[PDB]
Scaffold this active site. Structure first.
Site, PDB file in Angstrom:
ATOM      1  CG  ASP A 195      43.430  48.933  97.028  1.00  0.00           C
ATOM      2  OD1 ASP A 195      44.648  49.186  97.154  1.00  0.00           O
ATOM      3  OD2 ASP A 195      42.986  48.117  96.192  1.00  0.00           O
TER       4      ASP A 195
ATOM      5  CG  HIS B 146      45.992  46.046  96.506  1.00  0.00           C
ATOM      6  ND1 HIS B 146      45.232  46.558  95.478  1.00  0.00           N
ATOM      7  CD2 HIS B 146      47.051  45.435  95.923  1.00  0.00           C
ATOM      8  CE1 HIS B 146      45.803  46.267  94.323  1.00  0.00           C
ATOM      9  NE2 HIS B 146      46.908  45.586  94.565  1.00  0.00           N
TER      10      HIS B 146
ATOM     11  CD  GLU C 224      52.655  39.170  92.419  1.00  0.00           C
ATOM     12  OE1 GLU C 224      51.804  38.386  91.948  1.00  0.00           O
ATOM     13  OE2 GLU C 224      53.684  38.778  93.013  1.00  0.00           O
TER      14      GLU C 224
END
Ligand SMILES: *[C@@H]1O[C@H](CO)[C@@H](O[C@@H]2O[C@H](CO)[C@@H](O)[C@H](O)[C@H]2NC(C)=O)[C@H](O)[C@H]1NC(C)=O
Ligand SMILES: COc1ccc2cc3[n+](cc2c1OC)CCc1cc2c(cc1-3)OCO2
Ligand SMILES: *[C@@H]1O[C@H](CO)[C@@H](O)[C@H](O)[C@H]1NC(C)=O
Length: 572
Positions: free
Chosen positions: A227, A281, A346
């Site tokens: 991430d 991310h 997203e």
């Protein structure tokens, strides 16, 4: 010292009574009373077919338990390992600090694997099994597990270990005398999402998780391994990613360690599913590559959901050489997974817009700089990344993406197709997106944030207050959340569910409490899809929590132990 009380079943509740000496009726221990007072005894999850537990128990010599594999095959080392672990799981019936009397009948466990060569994970794998226990002669027990694959076989080994109870009044190890069980899960994907990038999780804690997952027949460990905050995955072909991206040199996941976890999971029927979230991310690890944008962009609330910001730049051709190497290294060590999770969280359009190279790329093409054109760029990225994922795994395999603006059912068919992409759902079970996606034939994995986000409820980690999805989701809400109610007629398209443990406020130290025993509620919901509610499973949930603690899991505490010993008196 010696137990003072006894228990007697009355209207499906074990009542604590004094064990008066002037009685001719044999005293029942607490768990012995529960094994037959409860509709399903001490089993978790409750089986889906026949659940015949008989009426009596038999005293057993712990040292006289022998397992025999009747059909040899390619899964020999797996069945041998699962057989060796079986005796440790039987010892879980005994409280720590108590020693059973080495007396009683001997147990013969007969493992019948009808296809002893099959050992691959797939959404179509057969996890069914048959379990029957009966007296054998005059001093033996015949426990026969019959299953169509190794995975169903070790599920039955798990259920058999739950048919042992310890009599702490008499220090006797007991087993159900006459059992007839047929069992198979309702959903093939019963998972836990572990985020090991927002915070590091020790390899030992990850394998402790897998141990607890197998105890309740969960079969998928979704390893959210990268991430924005860190890149602990050791990628040999792009070593700067983890050298610059890890939180420390020891907070990484080497090839040897991942192979350990993957093999540990396979021995326990747990598929280890890796995820590389993209194109958002991303962050730490990508410095000095010029393949990202808005890394640590300020103010972060203008550019991403949580700090630090940062997204891949899909306009650079070198990006897909990096991704291909990452996926290839993942496919090498995650060599039991049949599915690859590609994130699809997203994407921030304000971030992509703030890059000149990205704007020039879109002006040079027939695109503008509106919301609809950044959907062009996202699908452009996903199309190429998908190509590299297929190449890396040397096979076309199912891919998972999250519900997002890219996967909105109104236009998802412009980009993806229902045969290539599985959709993981974080929205509530009453959201219109679920019905629309199902009508387009898309397969779903349920991770509704109002019932399966195991991170909700704690204090805020930016500012003050509580985190975004508070309040804390109790196990009751986890148990009642049913995919069959959410999907209705299309329920066969629902592959199952997955408890999400995002790790902004969780790491090695909090792992046990975050997942257990709440994930056991999801385990029963996905295995059995009961028409009953949590209150019908309450007594057994209290027992499975104690069983987790016996395994060494620091499971959350649900109720005072007094309620466990005094069923019916704690209600509301
Ligand atoms: C242990 O129990 C199993 C099941 O109760 C026995 O297997 C059954 O054997 C009969 C004939 O003896 C068959 O008709 C059934 O189909 C078998 N069931 C299964 C599930 O295979 C087994 O014979 C017993 N073994 C011993 C040593 O007593
Ligand atoms: C993918 O689903 C997710 C995943 C993560 C999410 C994270 C957050 N939100 C929704 C999310 C969500 O729902 C869209 C709501 C706004 C927010 C503010 C925050 C924060 C996190 C979030 O931490 C700092 O302040
Ligand atoms: C991208 O930036 C331009 C400014 O040059 C702006 O006009 C446009 O609305 C932006 N797009 C989005 C989706 O905000």
């Amino acid at each position: 010292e010696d137990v003072v009380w006894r228990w007697s079943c009355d209207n499906g509740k074990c009542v604590k009574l004094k064990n008066d000496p002037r009685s001719s009726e044999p005293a029942l221990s607490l768990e012995a009373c529960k094994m037959f007072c409860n509709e399903y005894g001490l089993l978790w999850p409750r089986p889906t077919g026949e659940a015949d537990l008989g009426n009596f128990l038999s005293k057993i010599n712990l040292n006289s338990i022998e397992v025999k594999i009747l059909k040899k095959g390619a899964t020999d080392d797996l069945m041998e390992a699962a057989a060796k672990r079986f005796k440790e799981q039987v010892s879980l019936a005994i409280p720590r600090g108590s020693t059973p009397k080495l007396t009683g009948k001997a147990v013969d466990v007969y493992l019948v694997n009808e296809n002893p060569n099959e050992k691959a994970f797939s959404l179509e794998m057969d996890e069914s099994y048959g379990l029957r226990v009966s007296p054998s002669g005059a001093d033996r027990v015949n426990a026969t597990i019959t299953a169509n694959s190794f995975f169903g076989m070790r599920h039955g080994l798990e259920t058999l270990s739950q048919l042992f109870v310890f009599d702490d009044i008499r220090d006797h190890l007991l087993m159900v005398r006459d059992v007839n069980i047929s069992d198979k899960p309702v959903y093939p994907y019963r998972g836990i999402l572990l985020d090991t990038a927002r915070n590091y999780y020790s390899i030992e804690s990850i394998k402790r998780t897998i141990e607890a997952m197998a105890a309740v027949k969960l079969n998928t460990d979704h390893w959210h391994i990268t991430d924005s905050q860190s890149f602990p995955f050791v990628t040999t072909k792009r070593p700067n990613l983890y050298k610059f991206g890890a939180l420390s040199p020891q907070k990484v996941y080497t090839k040897a360690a991942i192979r350990e976890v993957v093999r540990f999971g396979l021995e326990r029927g747990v598929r280890v599913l890796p995820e590389f979230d993209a194109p958002a991310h991303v962050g730490e690890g990508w410095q000095d590559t010029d393949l990202t944008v808005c890394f640590k962009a300020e103010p972060w609330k203008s550019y991403c959901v949580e700090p630090p910001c940062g997204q891949l730049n899909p306009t650079k051709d070198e990006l897909y050489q990096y991704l291909e190497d990452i996926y290839s290294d993942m496919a090498e060590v995650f060599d039991t997974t049949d599915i690859f999770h590609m994130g699809g969280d997203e994407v921030s359009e304000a971030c992509w817009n703030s890059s000149d190279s990205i704007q020039n790329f879109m002006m040079q093409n027939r695109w503008d700089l509106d919301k609809e054109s950044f959907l062009k760029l996202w699908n452009y990225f996903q199309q190429k990344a998908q190509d590299k994922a297929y190449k890396a795994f040397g096979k076309k395999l199912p891919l998972i993406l999250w519900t997002s603006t890219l996967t909105n059912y109104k236009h998802i068919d412009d980009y993806l197709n229902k045969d290539d992409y599985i959709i993981q759902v974080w929205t509530t079970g009453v959201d219109p997106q679920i019905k629309g996606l199902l009508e387009k034939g898309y397969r779903l994995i349920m991770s509704n944030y109002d019932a399966l986000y195991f991170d909700c409820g704690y204090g805020a980690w930016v500012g003050a207050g509580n985190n975004w999805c508070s309040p804390y989701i109790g196990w009751q809400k986890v148990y009642d959340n049913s995919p069959a109610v959410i999907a209705l007629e299309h329920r066969d398209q629902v592959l199952g569910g997955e408890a999400a443990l995002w790790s902004e406020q969780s790491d090695t130290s909090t792992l046990d409490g975050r997942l257990w025993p709440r994930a056991a509620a999801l385990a029963e919901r996905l295995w059995a899809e009961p028409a009953t509610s949590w209150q019908d499973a309450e007594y057994r949930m209290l027992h499975i929590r104690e069983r987790f603690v016996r395994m060494g899991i620091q499971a959350e505490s649900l109720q005072p132990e007094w309620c466990y010993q005094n069923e019916g008196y704690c209600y509301s």
